[PDB]
Design a binder for these strands. Structure first.
Lengths: 67, 171, 270, 65, 194, 504, 268
RNA sequence: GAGAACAGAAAUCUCCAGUAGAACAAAAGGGUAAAAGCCCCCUUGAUUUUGAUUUUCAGUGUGAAUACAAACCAUGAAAGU
RNA sequence: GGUUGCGGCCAUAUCUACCAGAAAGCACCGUUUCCCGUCCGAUCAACUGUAGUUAAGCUGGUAAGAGCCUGACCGAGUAGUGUAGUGGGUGACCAUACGCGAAACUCAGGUGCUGCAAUCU
């Protein structure tokens, strides 16, 4: 069991452009789900980047830092 | 037009050529003595054919040469003319106002002889042209030299007679 | 002894190729080749150097022969305060700055086209450097003109490995040496070295500086003032014409040789 | 984990998705905030497994940079 | 302030992929004949109306904008707003016919019949156990030509008793490799013929 | 690279279908509108009928004629109450969407704007070398955009000429990291506060150090502020306030090069000090408190504001841009006399300070408790508003130059836009994939630039509330960014030891 | 050798074809008027133009082999043969070829009242940008001859195809108008070919998004009389109009792709 | 075609003329001359990896080949290739 | 009208020999510290327009020069080439109606037109 030296291991495998990020971010939120449509295949996307929702309130501050 | 200062004949380049024939240590010594003569590193020539009689393979080293331009060229030319005791044949000059001659021994030039150096000869070749000859050598707007402006054999012989006061032998 | 068969079968090149001043291999790629197929018009920043003048033009290729949009020359520099060294690196920088500022002023980018119907703001003006038959070497006056135009405000795509001060070993530049070449520090250093070493060379060269009483330390100041003047007033003021077109034409045609008629030629032959 | 790129033991194990030591995997690197020279956001890269998950109950990998 | 609203009896059709407009309205020969001096004005007015309608459609087309800067790949800058042209409607003949699908070779038929899935073609590098380096398996400095440079080769016992003993085994292996290459070339030529 | 899905066959057929043309109707009836100011809520003319095809320029001229100031018009923008701005004309902005009928009235709120325009920066002018360590701070000259000062971790600062993108001067007085750099509001002296608890003053024209360094702090300098020109008496030079890690704010008179006051009320490191236009100073510190001091009362602490549960990281003022700019403007005009400079600085300050009845100077504090507080410290001691929504600490906060908006750059890879008056939330700027370090406005309050840990800058359009242009190019994290006063250049610097200059 | 292989691969057929190239061939008899008209058309066609210079003995309606040989040698699917005769003065023959074989040919004669490109002396468009097209006449949609004319000219001057267009490149428009409506049994009216350059101004009625358009004639102005025709075979028409259909996604019933890119199936 | 010690018909150098008559592939009825020829510099990546897309292999079909596209990659001052 | 920069048409523009070119420009020409490249600052690179020259570069004219090019109501609707009325002729072959259609030869001529920008005694 050996791994040969290759520069393909150190290259980027997946990238996304800012325009694509904005398009998918705007599309996520405008989806109107139909009960008679089933999911045949899920698209592979950076959902951690795409799932950003505006929140009205912030979480409580960590008091153990100051006291 | 003869009174115009741009028709003066001067030295374009003095080429010292040494064709040793066989590549090796003798070619190295010829290169070393050419360097010690001209103050500049010589350049080698690659083979153009392959002849069994001449003992030359394909793409090998046969000759070296040095191009000298300026006061150093004038000094080397005056040394060569002092060695040749100011006597040049009529056939030494070419049809384009350029002339050459062979020197059998470089020791006559004044170079200190060394046992490892040996004995070497060289071909002097001096090129003459008037100012304005860079039209044929510049990159942009390349043009030909005019008919009246081209250097001729009689003109360069007259220039040599005026300069060095050396007779040109018919035979 | 060229033969009539050789003359008949001879194939002459283009006119500009015969009087070699144009590289058509470069021109076809500069004009007819496009990175994308969006039909964006292209412009060339043509830079040429004579023995005494620097010509910078912005040229757009057209089917009826190309058209010049703006131009700048080194003989306009006495207006801004540059009277000596009209073909040096600093002069090329100033000419590039001048043409950049003049083009920007003419276009109104910095103080009804169909693009205004679709886009809110104007685009930066993009020109591609055209050098013609010139050698690409580190420390060239054409790249100095390119640097001047880029600082002036034209978007000229370029790398910085041909500017003065570029280190060959490490892929980096010396901006201090670049500033020295911009403000003519090399010329001032040569002037000081000549004055310290050989007084006869300093009398022969730089005679105009001595005649106008210009010190070697004022080169930076006069170049800075010239750049400020160019930025303040980049408009094109043409030279005042002493004479008129008819006077010029008549006085030139007086010396130019008149044609001889065919009947006169026949009379001369017979 | 995004994909199993190469299991050094066998391509059969690679296509079966076996996670052993020395396996090259593809991982989501969105939270690392990597941007290329051209402004593209990197969200997938390669890593090599450095442990035995069948021994220690977890997968440890080193990102190949 | 001239209007941009052109009223036409027959509606002009548009092919925005080719940037073309077609109007099938009535054309009078009297206004377009060479005997009339206003033919240029008439043609210019009709072309002006058609170009105005085409430009109206083009400016009503959807527009693509980006955020990437200049100097990048793509050819579009952030300040540039482009039109999104639809696919052309007009059908035109091709300059060349569509490429036909190549017939299956003997190897392809055999592999399909025997269920031989194609190789993964990961790379050309293989590990040399006799050394500590990865070497190419073929080509320039490939591992398939190491026998030629091998310093010492044992002579096989099967070559004994034949006249080919005195030949260099490196030369024999080179000849065998060339024979295999020529056989592969002949099989490719045969597949092309069939 | 991941691509958006391609259009379907039905969508391509719909694209090939002919397009509708949005043309202005000719029989459009008259529309009743009521003018109203955003700041004051004053009604002009009541209900007036205008043509339905009214353009923005013609409506602006109508408003100027109503106000009686047609000779010197001032460009305004219009909004209608869901609030929708007027882009091109009333019909396309409101009537074409059909939200408001022709019979119903339209209430138009007018807001003043800038006469000039700043084009967005779309490319890098240059990448200039010279610094030996990471770049820590940067600033532009107030009078001109051709001078930029940059302090770095190699114990040096550099003055760069922005016209040729070349270094002009090197400032090598300090012994440790140059944490903060600042320019005098009259453009005469550059102040550098370093890691070695010292402050040095420099003449930029000669690139020289004025006397010896200011000493007295025991820990490193955190922030520098200058006395406003409109408060400085003519013929005098402005004083320099400095905050530091030791918890003291020291005031220096540079005419005699001495120290006058040493405010010492804070119990922890003072994050920032700001010198307002009403002779007051605001200090934010790591003891969760903001202290309001008076320069006219021997540096006494007027007020202590305590509403945060963590360190207050940054604070900003409504008139902060005017205080920084002094008497200069976007055209780079230089007053001839100190009296004229003082009067012009007073007018520039008042145009932002005194409006809607009484002069107010709002303050915003961004803290490590993921939140911000909006205060009006002159009238009240309680905070006017609380801005929440950030999931991590708010590293930077900035008022708009007109004081109408607040922008907050946080560590949750986001920027947030809020109203500058009441602090209500407006929008979120997203696109950074790492924590945003700091932010900067343009001169006409229409464009924003932000630098991030993801080695990129981003320019955002405030009106459309979306990303305008993404700027990569830095090899590592970008720490400092600034926009020129005339809005022609943007400077940035970080860990790559290179100064990036960006132009349109 | 690799350059030769690259040239062969470029010349071979493909799913997305390249821009069609046009070869301009002088005939045995040629005139200065023909040369100037050819120069103007080649300027409109470039950089997808190759021009011969010598005289070629070509009769398209008597033989096709020299044209086919030239097309195969130069990879030019468009041919413009310029000749002159007493029966056909200023004859331009446009030959469109499919697969190095003669697909169709048209033969037009230029009228005498034509003005060259240099007669107008006006600023023109940048080299190498696609034009707009206008066609006037219901025979372009009904009559087969004008169908062929419209298809030939759209194919000739269409240029490179793209899905994104910059608004700054919309410079010139080619107008092809039929000289009045005609009826059956009448001689075919001449086709008038004109080139115009666009100008835009504020309209004050279509807003700031719809400007008023104006035209300035550039030239050349040409009047083509339809001398001779040669139609393709129906099977050749079908073979030339076949679509590759490989690049696009196959349509499947009850299967859709939403904006997020998920594949969704419908059940009933 | 002229000039230069060995060096002559063929070794090496110089000047002028030199539509390619040299050298690369194809069998042009118009291939290439500031080159497509010769030399020098940089790259050893060229079997990269992403794809809801085309085609084909099941008991391992979110895998692999295959077609196409894109992101990259190399070089150049750049246009671009 | 001369010239300079970028061009289109690519010999009416090319080749060989003489003459003229006031001003401006172009070019030859001066130097080698800096950037750069060569055996050679010869080309390339840089500095000064400082020392000079219009001798060359370039443009124009001249030659019953070579080469090349344009109109023909010039050959000529001709040679040639494809059908045909049952046209004859058991015969090798011939006028005819309709289509397609040259060059050799002759007459008349010629040795650059032009777009953009700037400059000129």
């Amino acid at each position: 069991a050996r791994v040969q030296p290759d520069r393909r291991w150190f290259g980027n495998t997946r990238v996304i452009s800012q325009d694509a990020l904005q398009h998918f971010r705007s599309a996520l939120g405008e989806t109107q789900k139909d009960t008679y449509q089933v999911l045949l295949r899920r698209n592979k996307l950076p959902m951690s980047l795409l799932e950003e929702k505006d929140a009205d309130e912030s979480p409580k501050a960590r008091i153990l830092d100051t006291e | 037009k003869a009174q115009n200062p741009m028709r003066d004949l001067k030295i374009e380049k003095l080429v010292l050529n040494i064709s040793v024939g066989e590549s090796g240590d003798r070619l190295t010594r010829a290169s070393k003595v050419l360097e010690q003569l001209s103050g500049q590193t010589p350049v080698q020539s690659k083979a153009r054919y392959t002849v069994r009689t001449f003992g030359i393979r394909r793409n090998e080293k046969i000759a070296v040469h040095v191009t000298v331009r300026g006061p150093k060229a004038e000094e080397i030319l005056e040394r060569g003319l002092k060695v040749k005791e100011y006597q040049l044949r009529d056939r030494n000059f070419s049809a384009t106002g350029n002339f050459g001659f062979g020197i059998d021994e470089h020791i006559d030039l004044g170079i200190k002889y060394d046992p490892s150096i040996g004995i070497f000869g060289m071909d002097f070749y001096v090129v003459m042209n008037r100012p304005g000859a860079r039209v044929t050598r510049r990159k942009r707007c390349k043009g030909t030299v005019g008919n009246s402006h081209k250097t001729t054999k009689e003109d360069t012989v007259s220039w040599f007679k005026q300069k060095y006061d050396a007779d040109v032998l018919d035979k | 002894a060229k033969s009539s068969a050789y003359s008949s079968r001879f194939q002459t090149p283009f006119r500009r190729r015969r009087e070699g001043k144009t590289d058509y291999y470069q021109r076809k790629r500069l004009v007819t080749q496009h990175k994308a197929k969006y039909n964006t018009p292209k412009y060339r920043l043509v830079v040429r150097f004579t023995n005494k003048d620097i010509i910078c033009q912005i040229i757009s290729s057209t089917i009826t022969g190309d058209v010049v949009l703006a131009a700048a020359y080194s003989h306009e520099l006495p207006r801004y305060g540059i009277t000596h060294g009209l073909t040096n690196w600093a002069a090329a920088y100033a000419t590039g700055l001048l043409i950049a500022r003049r083009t920007l002023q003419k276009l109104g980018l910095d103080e009804y086209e169909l693009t205004e119907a679709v886009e809110d703001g104007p685009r930066p003006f993009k020109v591609f450097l055209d050098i013609g038959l010139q050698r690409t070497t580190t420390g060239a006056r054409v790249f100095g003109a390119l640097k001047g135009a880029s600082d002036g405000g034209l978007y000229v795509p370029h790398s910085e490995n041909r500017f003065p001060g570029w280190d060959f070993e490490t892929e980096e530049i010396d901006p201090e040496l670049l500033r020295s070449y911009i403000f003519g520090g090399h010329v001032s250093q040569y002037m000081e070295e000549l004055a310290d070493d050989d007084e006869e060379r300093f009398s022969e060269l730089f005679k105009g500086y001595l005649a106008d009483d210009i010190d070697a330390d004022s080169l930076e100041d006069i170049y800075t003032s010239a750049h400020e003047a160019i930025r303040a007033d980049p408009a094109f003021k043409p030279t005042e014409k002493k004479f008129t077109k008819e006077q010029y034409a008549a006085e030139s045609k007086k010396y130019r040789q008149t044609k001889l008629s065919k009947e006169e030629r026949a009379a001369r032959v017979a | 984990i995004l994909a199993v790129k190469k299991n050094p033991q066998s391509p059969m194990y690679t296509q079966l998705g076996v996670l052993t030591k020395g396996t090259i995997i593809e991982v989501n690197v969105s939270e690392l905030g990597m941007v290329t020279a051209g402004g593209k956001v990197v969200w997938g890269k390669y890593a090599q497994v450095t442990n035995e998950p069948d021994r220690d109950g977890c997968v440890n990998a080193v990102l190949l940079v | 302030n001239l209007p941009v609203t052109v009223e036409k009896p027959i509606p002009v059709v548009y092919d925005l992929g080719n940037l073309a407009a077609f109007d099938s309205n009535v054309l009078d020969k009297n206004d377009l004949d060479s005997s009339n001096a206003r033919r240029e004005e008439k043609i210019k007015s009709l072309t002006r109306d058609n170009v105005q309608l085409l430009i109206n459609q083009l400016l009503s087309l959807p527009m693509k904008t980006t955020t990437e800067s200049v100097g990048g790949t793509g050819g579009q800058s952030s300040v540039m707003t482009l039109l999104q042209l639809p696919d052309p409607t007009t059908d035109l003949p091709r300059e060349k016919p569509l490429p036909k699908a190549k017939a299956m070779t003997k190897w392809e038929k055999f592999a399909a019949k025997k269920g031989i899935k194609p190789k993964e073609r990961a790379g050309k590098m293989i590990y040399d156990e006799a050394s500590g380096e990865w070497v190419p398996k073929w080509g320039y400095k490939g591992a398939n030509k190491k026998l030629d440079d091998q310093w010492l080769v044992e002579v096989d016992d099967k070559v004994k008793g034949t006249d080919n003993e005195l030949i260099d085994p490196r030369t024999l292996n080179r000849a065998e490799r060339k024979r295999l290459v020529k056989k592969n070339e002949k099989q490719q030529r045969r597949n092309m013929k069939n | 690279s991941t691509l958006i899905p391609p259009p379907s066959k039905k969508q391509k057929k719909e694209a090939q279908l002919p397009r509708e043309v949005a043309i202005i109707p000719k029989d459009l009836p008259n529309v009743s509108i009521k003018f109203q100011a955003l700041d004051t809520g004053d009604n002009v003319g009541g209900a007036l009928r205008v043509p339905g095809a009214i353009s923005e320029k013609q409506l602006e001229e109508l408003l100027n004629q109503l106000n009686g100031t047609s000779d010197d018009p001032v460009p305004y923008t219009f909004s209608c109450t869901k609030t929708i701005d007027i882009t091109d004309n009333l019909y396309s902005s409101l009537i074409k969407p059909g939200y408001n009928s022709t019979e119903d009235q339209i209430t138009l709120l007018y807001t003043p704007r800038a006469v000039f325009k700043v084009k967005p920066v779309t490319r890098s002018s240059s990448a200039i070398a010279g610094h030996g360590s990471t770049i820590l701070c940067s600033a532009f000259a107030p009078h001109t955009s051709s001078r930029m000062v940059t302090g770095a971790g190699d114990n040096t600062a550099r003055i760069w000429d922005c016209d040729t993108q070349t270094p002009m001067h090197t400032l090598k007085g300090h012994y440790n990291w140059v944490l903060c750099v600042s320019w005098s509001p009259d453009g005469e002296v550059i102040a550098t506060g370093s890691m070695d608890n010292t402050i040095r003053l420099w003449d930029p024209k000669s690139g020289q150090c004025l006397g010896d360094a200011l000493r007295g702090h025991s820990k490193w300098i955190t922030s520098l502020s200058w006395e406003p020109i409109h408060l400085v008496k003519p013929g005098s030079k402005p004083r320099l306030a400095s905050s530091s890690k030791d918890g003291t704010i020291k005031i220096w008179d540079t005419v005699s090069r001495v120290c006058q006051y040493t405010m010492s009320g804070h119990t922890n490191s003072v994050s920032c000090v700001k010198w307002g236009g009403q002779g007051l100073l605001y200090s934010g510190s790591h003891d969760r408190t903001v202290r309001v001091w008076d320069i006219n009362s021997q540096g006494r602490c007027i007020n202590i504001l305590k509403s945060h549960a963590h360190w207050v990281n940054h604070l900003s003022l409504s008139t902060d841009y005017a205080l920084r700019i002094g008497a200069f403007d976007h055209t780079g005009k230089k007053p001839s006399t100190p009296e004229e400079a003082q009067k012009k600085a007073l007018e520039n300050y008042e145009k932002i300070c005194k409006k809607n009845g009484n002069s107010e100077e709002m303050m915003v504090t961004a803290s490590d408790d993921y939140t911000m507080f909006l205060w009006n410290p002159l009238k009240s001691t309680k905070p006017i508003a609380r801005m929440t929504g950030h999931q991590k600490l708010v590293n930077h906060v900035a008022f708009s130059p007109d004081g109408r908006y607040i922008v907050s750059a946080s560590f949750d890879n986001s920027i947030k836009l809020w109203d500058g008056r009441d602090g209500k939330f407006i929008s979120t700027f997203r696109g950074h994939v790492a924590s945003v370090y700091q932010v900067a406005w343009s001169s006409d309050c229409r464009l924003l630039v932000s630098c991030s840990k993801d080695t990129t800058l981003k320019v955002w359009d405030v009106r459309t509330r979306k990303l305008s242009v993404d700027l990569p190019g830095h090899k590592d994290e970008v720490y400092t960014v600034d926009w020129s006063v005339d809005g022609k250049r943007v400077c940035s610097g970080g860990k790559d030891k290179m100064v990036r200059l960006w132009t349109h | 050798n690799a350059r030769a292989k690259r040239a062969l691969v470029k010349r071979e057929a493909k799913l997305v074809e390249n821009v069609k190239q046009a070869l301009f061939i002088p005939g045995q008899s040629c005139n200065k008027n023909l040369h100037d008209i050819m120069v103007d058309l080649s300027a409109l066609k470039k950089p997808d133009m190759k021009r011969f210079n010598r005289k070629n003995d070509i009769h398209p309606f008597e033989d096709m082999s020299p044209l086919e040989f030239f097309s195969e040698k130069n990879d030019c699917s468009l041919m413009v043969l310029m000749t002159s005769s007493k029966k056909r003065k200023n004859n331009m023959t446009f030959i469109r070829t499919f697969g190095y074989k003669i697909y169709d040919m048209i033969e037009l004669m230029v009228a005498d009242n034509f003005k060259l490109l240099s007669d107008f002396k006006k600023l023109t468009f940048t080299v190498g940008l696609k034009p707009m097209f206008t066609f006037q006449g219901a025979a372009f949609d009904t009559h087969p001859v004008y169908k062929q004319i419209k298809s030939l000219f759209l194919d000739f001057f269409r240029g490179e195809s793209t899905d994104l267009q910059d608004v700054a490149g919309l410079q010139h428009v080619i107008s092809m108008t039929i000289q009045g409506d005609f009826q059956d049994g009448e001689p075919l009216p001449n086709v008038l070919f004109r080139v115009y350059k666009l100008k835009s101004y504020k309209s004050d009625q279509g807003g700031k998004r719809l400007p008023r358009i104006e035209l300035v004639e550039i030239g050349p102005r040409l009047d083509f009389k339809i001398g001779r025709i040669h139609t393709p075979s129906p099977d050749m028409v079908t073979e030339a109009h076949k679509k590759p259909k490989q690049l696009e996604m196959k349509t499947k019933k009850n299967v859709e792709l939403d904006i997020m890119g998920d594949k969704l199936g419908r059940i009933h």
